[PDB]
Amino acid sequence: EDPHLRNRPGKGHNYIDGMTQEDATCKPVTYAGACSSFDVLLEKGKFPLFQSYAHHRTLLEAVHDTIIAKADPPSCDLQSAHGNPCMKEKLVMKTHCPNDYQSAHYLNNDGKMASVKCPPKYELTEDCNFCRQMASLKKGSYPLQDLFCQSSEDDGSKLKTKMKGVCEVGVQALKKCDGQLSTAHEVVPFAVFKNSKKVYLDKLDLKTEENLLPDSFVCFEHKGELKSFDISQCPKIGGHGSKKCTGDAAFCSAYECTAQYANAYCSHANGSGIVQIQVSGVWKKPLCVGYERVVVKRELS
């Protein structure tokens, strides 16, 4: 009934170029191995949205699934000369880096995927800006957003950020304000579409619909609660396959149940489906919807 928080649908890869030293445990992501770029995603009281949307892809999994484009360079150096292009769009990002973690990624305003890192031997600070000296350096990427991604190919180039009372959020210049600017940090959700930019929205409406997708069921392995089991090995309805699986009416109504000839008692996952957002009063298919803290320059004079 209750879906797990570690069963990653699809490929289940959480690594990036330049910091892929953790590929022994983060490729794939299962119960074996402590993935540094996934342990903080399940912290109680930190990322409630990621815990509410269990069976859903993340930013890195969307990058590996050819969903979210990559930046150039995707891994900018912090202690490098000739400036740093991955700082102008990240300085207005109010984040918080704990300890141990050396690299950190973020969703830029250009719809791509950028990341920063400290050269050895350095680590991140409290403001996630420069580098400092310290124990161990977790060769990975600390997530700085609470976003969820999925597979979609809905075009949305005719929709941009149209917030009320906002002159310039992040680095994208919205409306022309001849007065002063109120440089302050606040909370505001956002949604990135296909072939567009990071569109910011003040309000959002989430819709969840249940279907017969393979990424909407959880299985408990046994001999023939308990532990998890790979659902891709379960046979389909009207056919056969690798191993055998069984479950209740929700699982038997979609696949084939062998009862006593199975090896994993499957069930229905209570936390999946296709998530759609309502922008401009029209229901569309978003890609990655998050909820971070940015610096919004509102009006004043």
Q: Which residues of this protein are in contact with other proteins, per CB under 8 A?
A: 162, 164, 175, 280-281
Q: Would you say 1 and 268 are in contact if contact means Cβ atoms under 8 Å apart?
A: yes
Tell me the closest approach of the beta carbon of residue 39 to other proteins, in angstroms: 34
Residue number, 140 or 189, with CB nearest to other proteins: 189
Tell me the closest approach of the beta carbon of residue 162 to other proteins, in angstroms: 6
Count other Cβ atoms within 10 Å, centred on residue 116: 22
Residue 87 and residue 206: Cα distance in Å, rounded? 32
Tell me the closest approach of the beta carbon of residue 164 to other proteins, in angstroms: 7
Tell me the closest approach of the beta carbon of residue 22 to other proteins, in angstroms: 43
Q: Which residues pair with 290 in a beta bridge?
A: 190
Residue number, 17 or 186, with CB nearest to other proteins: 186
Residue number, 82 or 164, with CB nearest to other proteins: 164
Tokens standing for residue 42: 């399940």
Residues sharing a CB contact under 8 Å with residue 281, sequence separation 6 or more, in sequence order: none
Half-sphere exposure of 243 (CA within 13 A, CB side): 19
Residue number, 203 or 223, with CB nearest to other proteins: 203
Residue number, 135 or 282, with CB nearest to other proteins: 282
Q: Which residues pair with 288 in a beta bridge?
A: 149, 192
Report, in this order, helix, strand and coil percent for the chain, each rounded to 5: 10, 30, 60
Tokens standing for residue 28: 């794939």
Tell me the closest approach of the beta carbon of residue 138 to other proteins, in angstroms: 39
